[PDB]
Amino acid sequence: PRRAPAFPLSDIKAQMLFANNIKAQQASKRSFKEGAIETYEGLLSVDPRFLSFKNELSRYLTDHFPANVDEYGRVYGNGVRTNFFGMRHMNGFPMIPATWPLASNLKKRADADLADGPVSERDNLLFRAAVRLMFSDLEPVPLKIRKGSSTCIPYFSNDMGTKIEIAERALEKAEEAGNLMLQGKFDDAYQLHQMGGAYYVVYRAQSTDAITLDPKTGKFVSKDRMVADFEYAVTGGEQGSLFAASKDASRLKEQYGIDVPDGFFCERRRTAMGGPFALNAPIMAVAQPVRNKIYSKYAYTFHHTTRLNKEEKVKEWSLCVATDVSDHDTFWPGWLRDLICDELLNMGYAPWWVKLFETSLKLPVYVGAPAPEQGHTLLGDPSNPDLEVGLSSGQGATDLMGTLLMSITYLVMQLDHTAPHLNSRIKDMPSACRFLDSYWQGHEEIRQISKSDDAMLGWTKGRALVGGHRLFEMLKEGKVNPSPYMKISYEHGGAFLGDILLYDSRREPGSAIFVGNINSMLNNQFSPEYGVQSGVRDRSKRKRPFPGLAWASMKDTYGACPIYSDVLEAIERCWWNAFGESYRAYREDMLKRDTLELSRYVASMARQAGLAELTPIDLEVLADPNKLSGTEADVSANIHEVLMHGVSVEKTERFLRSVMPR
Numbered sequence: 042p043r044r045a046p047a048f049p050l051s052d053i054k055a056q057m058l059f060a061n062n063i064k065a066q067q068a069s070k071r072s073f074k075e076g077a078i079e080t081y082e083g084l085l086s087v088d089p090r091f092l093s094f095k096n097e098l099s100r101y102l103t104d105h106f107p108a109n110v111d112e113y114g115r116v117y118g119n120g121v122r123t124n125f126f127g128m129r130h131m132n133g134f135p136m137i138p139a140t141w142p143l144a145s146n147l148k149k150r151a152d153a154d155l156a157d158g159p160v161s162e163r164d165n166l167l168f169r170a171a172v173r174l175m176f177s178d179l180e181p182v183p184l185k186i187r188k189g190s191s192t193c194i195p196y197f198s199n200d201m202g203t204k205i206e207i208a209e210r211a212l213e214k215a216e217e218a219g220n221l222m223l224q225g226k227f228d229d230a231y232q233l234h235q236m237g238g239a240y241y242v243v244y245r246a247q248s249t250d251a252i253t254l255d256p257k258t259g260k261f262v263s264k265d266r267m268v269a270d271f272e273y274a275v276t277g278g279e280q281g282s283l284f285a286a287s288k289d290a291s292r293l294k295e296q297y298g299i300d301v302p303d304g305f306f307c308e309r310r311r312t313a314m315g316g317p318f319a320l321n322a323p324i325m326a327v328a329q330p331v332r333n334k335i336y337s338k339y340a341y342t343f344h345h346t347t348r349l350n351k352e353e354k355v356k357e358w359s360l361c362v363a364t365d366v367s368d369h370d371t372f373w374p375g376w377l378r379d380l381i382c383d384e385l386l387n388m389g390y391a392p393w394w395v396k397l398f399e400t401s402l403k404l405p406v407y408v409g410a411p412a413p414e415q416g417h418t419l420l421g422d423p424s425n426p427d428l429e430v431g432l433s434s435g436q437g438a439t440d441l442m443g444t445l446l447m448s449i450t451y452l453v454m455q456l457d458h459t460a461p462h463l464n465s466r467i468k469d470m471p472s473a474c475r476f477l478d479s480y481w482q483g484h485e486e487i488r489q490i491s492k493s494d495d496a497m498l499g500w501t502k503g504r505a506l507v508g509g510h511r512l513f514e515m516l517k518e519g520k521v522n523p524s525p526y527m528k529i530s531y532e533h534g535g536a537f538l539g540d541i542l543l544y545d546s547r548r549e550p551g552s553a554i555f556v557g558n559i560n561s562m563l564n565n566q567f568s569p570e571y572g573v574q575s576g577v578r579d580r581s582k583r584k585r586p587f588p589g590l591a592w593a594s595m596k597d598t599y600g601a602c603p604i605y606s607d608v609l610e611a612i613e614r615c616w617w618n619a620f621g622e623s624y625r626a627y628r629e630d631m632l633k634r635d636t637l638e639l640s641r642y643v644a645s646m647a648r649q650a651g652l653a654e655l656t657p658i659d660l661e662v663l664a665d666p667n668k669l670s671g672t673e674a675d676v677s678a679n680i681h682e683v684l685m686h687g688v689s690v691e692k693t694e695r696f697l698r699s700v701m702p703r
Contacts, residue, residue, distance in 0.1 A: 044276045045144035045428065050417040057231075058238050058407055058419065064197040068241065070417065073410040077133040077299070078572035081588060081631070086132035086572075087293075092302050094619040095128045095567060102563070102611055106604055113517055114363065114533035115544045120556055120603045122534030122541060127249030127560065128567050129261065131301065134293055135310040136286040138412030139244045140268035142312050144420045145277030145429040146371055152278075156525045158376045163456075163464060166473035167449050168377065172384040173474055174339070174481070175445065179330035179701065181694040183687035184208055184322060185673055187666070189582030192318035193435070194238040194407070199582065201686050208322045208688050211236070212696040215323035219393025222400060228424050235319035236397065238423055239405040240433050247309035248568035250288075254304075261304035263288045275420060277429075314406055316435030323397055324437035326693050327700060331441055336672060341483030342448065342490050346658075346675045348540050348555035348601075354483070354490055355542070358499035358550040360509045362516065363535025363542065364451070366494035367528040369443060373431035374526070377446050378402045389702030400426050401436045440670065443493030450526045451496055452480060455487040458515070458523060459500070459508025463487075490537065497537050499550070543603070557599035559608060565591070565665075580642065581683055587639055587663045589631030593652060594660035639663065645679045655680075 048054045050069050059065040077087040084091060102125040109118030116122045143149065150157065159165035192198045192207055211234065218230040222237075231237035251264035265285040273281025288306040293299040336344045345351050355361050366372075382399045386392060405421025405428055421428040432439050456463060463485075467473050479485055486503030489496060500509035515523055516531035523529055535542055540555040571584035580586045599605050609625075616624035640646040645654075652660065659680045662669045666684055673681045 042145060042147060042277060044280075045420050046422045047271075047275050048419045048422075050419075052419070054423065055407065055417075055419045058194045058423075060195040060197065062196070064199075065195065068197050068409070069407075071409055073413040073415070075134050077131070078569070079575065080132065080567070080569055081573060082575055087299050089300060090619045092305065094615055096302055096304070097618065098563075098567075098612060098615040099125045099128050101615065102608065105611075106559075106607070108534065110534040111544075111548070113513065114531050114535050115548060116534045116536070116541055117544045117546075117548070118603065120541055120543050120559060122536070122558070123251075123560060124253070125560065125563060126252035126254065126261065126304075127564050129252055129305050130248050130250070130308050130568060131290045131293065131299075131305050132246070132248050132308060132568055133572075134290055134307045135244065135246065136266060136288045136307045138268060138270075138286055138415060139310045140266075140286070140312060141271045141274035141408060141411060142242060142314070142406055142420070143269060143274050143277055143371060143430055144406075146373075146375070146431045147429055148277045148279060150372060150374065153372075153528060154522070154525075155372065155374075155527060157374070159380070160525045163467050164449070164453055165380075166467055166470060167452065167477060168380055168445070169384045169470060170473040170477040171445050171449050172381050173388060173470070174478055175331055175335060175441070176327070176385060176388060176390070177334070179327070179334060179697070181690065181697040182329060182333065183690045184212075184326050184693050185329065185681070185685045185687045188684050188686060189579070191315060193241045193315040194317045195235050196318075204318065205686070205688060207235075207318055209692055210234075211319050211322040212326060212688075212692060215397060215696070216391065216393045216699065219391070219396040222396045223393060225425070227400075227426065231423060235317060236323075237320060237400065237404070237426070238317045239407045239419055239421065240314035240316055240435055242406055242408045242411075243313050243315055244310040244409075244411065245313045246570050247311055248570055249564040250309040252304075252306065261306075263306045264309075266309050271415075271418070314433045314435045316401070316433065316437065317404075320397060320401055321435070321437035323394065323696070323700075324401055326696055327394070327398075328438040328441060330697070331438070332672060335444075335481075336674075339478075339481040342481045342488070343444070343492065344671075345490060345492070345538050346671055348557075351490065351537060351540065352553075352555045354488075355497065355499065355550045355553065355555075357501065358488060359502055359506055360500040360513065361535075361542070361550040361553070362498045362509070362513045363532040363537065364494075364496050364498060364516075365530045365532045366447065367530070369447075369494040369527065370432040370434065370439075371430070372527055373443065373446060375402070375429045375431075377442075381442075381445065391700045394700040398438075402433065402442075403428055404433065404436075406430065406433070440493060444491070447493055447496065447527070448481075448489065448491060450524055450529070451489050451491060451498060452477075452487075453526070454512070454523050454529065455489075455498060455505065455509075458512040460487050460505040462504055492538060495537060497535070497542070554601075556601045556603070559599060559602040559604060562595070562599045562602075562608070563612075569665075570667075580638070584667075585665055586684070587635040589628065589633075589635030589664070590639070590660045591664035592628040592632045593636075593655075594657040594664070597657035598661065642683055643679050 077085045106121045108121045110116045214234040218234045218236040221230040268286045403426040407419045410416035486501045488499035544553045574583045636651045
């Protein structure tokens with residue numbers, strides 16, 4: 042539908058996206074870059090010994106720990122759900138090329154038989170109900186900011202003091218910018234308060250994507266990842282091409298003189314979009330309050346933390362189906378955006394605010410460098426935001442957006458295939474609301490626990506139960522997509538929020554237990570997404586603040602894995618063969634070192650008083666913060682201080698009062 046506008050960095054429109062400083066300008070022109078990461082201090086992802094280690098362990102662990110997942114994708118036995126070839130990637134060397142991000146996802150949704158709006162009056166009521174229940178009685182709280190993160194367009198600052206002004210000033214001028222926007226003065230809102238502009242594409246890594254070995258030839262094979270080229274992207278796929286990127290890493294010997302072991306591959310790269318802080322702030326200010334309501338009041342379906350916690354919810358179920366949404370963010374419907382906005386307006390949210398929100402989800406995107414000799418292009422015209430790319434990863438409330446979309450979708454699936462005897466309880470907004478409120482609280486024979494594209498669907502004894510099994514069956518045959526909204530299937534080797542649901546011979550939620558995902562321990566330890574950035578002084582700013590700390594939480598996390606100790610033995614053994622050293626030793630040193638270094642940051646920790654008071658999860662997050670966006674409550678207070686910094690509650694309260702319908 043009408044190719045999207047595109048402009049070269051040279052055009053004033055692009056140029057106007059980066060402040061006249063230094064980062065900023067490097068962000069514009071930054072070019073394609075790849076390179077072996079420093080997995081751990083003084084250890085390169087491609088160090089021969091290391092590769093040799095990866096090569097041996099991968100094969101070993103695979104020959105001795107077959108996956109145990111049944112035809113319904115239920116994982117049993119050893120808890121292993123796939124092979125260990127993920128480690129065979131050359132961390133730091135991305136598949137060429139990355140995909141250009143689609144400017145419109147309408148043809149896509151359509152060509153997938155996905156609805157371009159609620160298909161039924163019932164559904165429409167449900168979605169709206171979710172908006173009402175989610176955005177209703179919020180309580181103001183300070184706007185927390187991640188330490189080290191970038192403000193992006195226009196300034197690209199990593200500096201907290203600055204981030205705090207930017208943010209504070211933003212709430213000051215949010216209303217004025219939104220209004221500017223209501224009148225269509227985009228360029229004005231942007232130039233005056235930097236609210237608008239574009240999203241800044243950055244390509245993140247998937248250091249472990251599927252690899253399989255052909256039993257016949259012994260040759261290895263990596264999952265093919267389709268990618269759109271510019272043409273295809275600026276036309277929403279009506280033109281251009283869609284092909285497989287190349288994960289072949291042979292090029293590495295000839296380009297870097299890097300000896301590449303047989304069966305190793307280039308990493309998969311995911312497109313990530315960093316938002317314009319000025320604009321996300323006013324949005325975040327509402328987002329977190331929303332997270333608190335749902336995490337509190339509808340904690341049944343939305344608040345998960347503790348294998349036990351989760352487990353306890355599932356065991357009560359007669360049937361637990363684990364789903365799988367496909368390419369969720371690219372498919373997320375622009376129409377849900379519009380509806381959410383609509384209802385919000387009806388709830389009486391400040392139109393200017395709704396407008397900002399709306400716009401945050403139509404914004405152009407500046408593509409950096411998806412491959413050599415490629416990129417530095419802005420798709421979409423900021424003067425008037427009209428992109429339809431789905432969920433932009435850097436929008437201030439993308440978790441909420443995916444959840445709102447998905448939760449309802451899941452519910453509708455249950456209604457559709459197993460509980461028509463409930464439709465009568467959803468006859469208007471009021472009933473719709475009461476119904477959903479009940480649903481989300483775990484009080485219906487059809488239950489759900491989820492978080493965006495990750496969820497488990499439940500059935501208790503009741504009429505729906507027989508339907509439940511049919512649905513489960515449908516999903517197994519996988520010949521028909523059960524939702525009119527997204528492409529859903531079952532998780533083969535189902536798991537939720539990282540933990541694996543280990544069934545027993547009974548194969549019923551009743552006697553199932555959540556356990557760590559052994560494959561995740563190895564991925565995490567030998568295929569990290571980021572090096573350790575030893576060159577960065579402030580650790581709180583690093584992607585991996587305290588590597589060593591993981592060792593501490595390890596046993597707590599993966600201890601109940603049926604093969605936990607065997608794996609460790611295996612590692613140790615292979616590490617010896619490759620480094621002539623004790624891997625365990627190594628990690629303990631790192632632990633000690635970090636534990637000390639840690640107190641240099643945390644105050645309520647004597648400059649030698651160590652851990653103890655830390656939760657396995659803190660230990661988990663300090664090692665890697667992308668490990669809990671659950672919230673600033675699932676983590677020790679002294680901890681958030683380490684990784685976040687908030688804006689005055691006084692300031693947000695003032696702000697919120699003006700947005701809230703009341």
